[PDB]
């Protein structure tokens, strides 16, 4: 793996996601959006097993675009979360288990708060200020512990994010070929395409 990051601030949630796709010996693509939009104000980044990864995220995309369309209501993050969880917990005692880890981040239009949820391929779900899957956590959690305030402006938090990626490029053996940073707030899901040099 395969870098999946995310930090929830005051007014939004931010998700980092390595750009690289590696097939054993060669790096096949240097530009992979490792995230599906689940709805206007809810984003899901993901990493894990080869094919299992995308096929899951798209199944969830479908099922949430369907509940959106049906009740003409934007399903709240807490709920999209607790649904994605159940769908993983279901597949863990199944025949071939989805082997996928995800970060769900979105804006609860009703509490006007940002929320970040972390769910592993087992169905283990917990809500966090910041989170990560794979080994991404070891190099970066020590920095977040230290520099994180929950009142951080969206700008203050992008800064702290670049600092983590920098540490991962320094002490991590994998060449993950950068990140794509996406932001989720009241206005929805936008992507900062000026990052590896901000």
């Amino acid at each position: 793996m395969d870098i999946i990051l995310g930090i929830r601030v005051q007014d939004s949630v931010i998700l980092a996601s390595s750009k690289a796709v590696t097939r054993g010996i060669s790096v096949l693509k240097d530009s992979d959006d490792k995230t599906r939009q689940l709805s206007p104000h809810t984003l899901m980044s993901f990493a894990g097993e080869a094919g299992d990864t995308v096929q899951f995220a798209e199944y969830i995309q479908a099922n949430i675009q369907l509940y959106s369309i049906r009740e003409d209501y934007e399903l709240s993050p807490q709920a999209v979360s607790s649904f994605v969880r159940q769908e993983l917990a279901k597949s863990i005692r199944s025949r071939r288990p989805y082997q996928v880890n995800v970060l769900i981040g979105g804006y609860d239009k009703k509490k006007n708060k940002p929320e970040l949820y972390q769910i592993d391929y087992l169905g283990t779900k917990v809500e966090l200020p910041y989170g990560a899957h794979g080994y991404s956590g070891f190099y970066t959690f020590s920095l977040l512990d230290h520099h994180y305030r929950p009142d951080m402006t969206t700008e203050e938090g992008l800064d702290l994010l670049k600092l983590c990626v920098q540490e991962l490029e320094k002490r991590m053996p994998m060449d993950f070929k950068g990140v794509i940073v996406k932001i989720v707030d009241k206005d929805g899901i936008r992507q900062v395409d000026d990052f590896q040099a901000q």
Binding site: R85, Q86, L88, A89, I92, R93, Q118, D120, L122, G123, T124, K125, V126, L128, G131, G137, F138, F141
Partner: protein, 204 residues
């Protein structure tokens, strides 16, 4: 490797004079890495409490499940479900998946509202009901908690006393445990009032 101990955590329950206590740590971690310090292992359904240790996605699943099952007992049975009963529902319910178990170590604790009698019991992942007058322990510090309780316990503790006793048993086991800690919470359950205190402990 072992499922019963990737995530971690412990839960402990005792009886006193017309009261009961149940407590846990707030730790959830993948192996060595601590991930959350706000992950409680104790859930309630009416006046019956259930602590569950072990694998997170199963601790969570069983809460989600017993809410469901007990919510319908309330509607269908016209009353809130009793501790003695709920116990027997956890047994049969766990043993349903005998050959593909939920990797959990449940502890039931609460007070029978008709007889006012205190009640605690614990299970293994397939539903053996260990009912016990004294105390029930469970988790990655199965051993350490048994050690503390066997020494620190006397029966018929007054509640304000049994909080000190149960807190010290939990705290001091989790400090000798690598996969437990990061906070703690302790419910003290009188016949009609229920107090929930969080604790101060090392954070390592």
């Amino acid at each position: 490797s072992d499922p019963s101990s990737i995530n971690g955590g412990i839960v402990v329950a005792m009886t006193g004079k017309d009261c009961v206590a149940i407590a846990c740590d707030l730790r959830l971690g993948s192996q060595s890495l601590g991930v959350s310090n706000k992950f409680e292992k104790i859930f309630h359904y009416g006046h019956v409490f259930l602590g569950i240790t072990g694998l997170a996605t199963d601790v969570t699943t069983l809460n989600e499940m017993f809410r469901y099952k007990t919510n319908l007992y309330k509607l269908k049975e016209e009353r809130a479900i009793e501790p003695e009963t709920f116990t027997q529902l956890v047994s049969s319910s766990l043993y349903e998946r005998r050959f593909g178990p939920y990797f959990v170590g449940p502890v039931v604790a609460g007070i029978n509202s008709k007889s006012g009698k205190p009640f605690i019991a614990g299970f293994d992942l397939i539903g053996c009901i260990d009912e016990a007058k004294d105390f029930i322990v469970s988790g990655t510090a199965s051993d350490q908690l048994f050690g503390m309780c066997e020494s620190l316990y006397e029966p018929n503790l007054e509640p304000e006393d049994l909080f000190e006793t149960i807190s010290q048993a939990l705290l001091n086991a989790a400090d000798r445990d690598a996969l437990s800690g990061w906070g703690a919470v302790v419910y003290i359950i009188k016949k009609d009032e229920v107090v929930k205190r969080y604790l101060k402990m090392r954070q390592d």
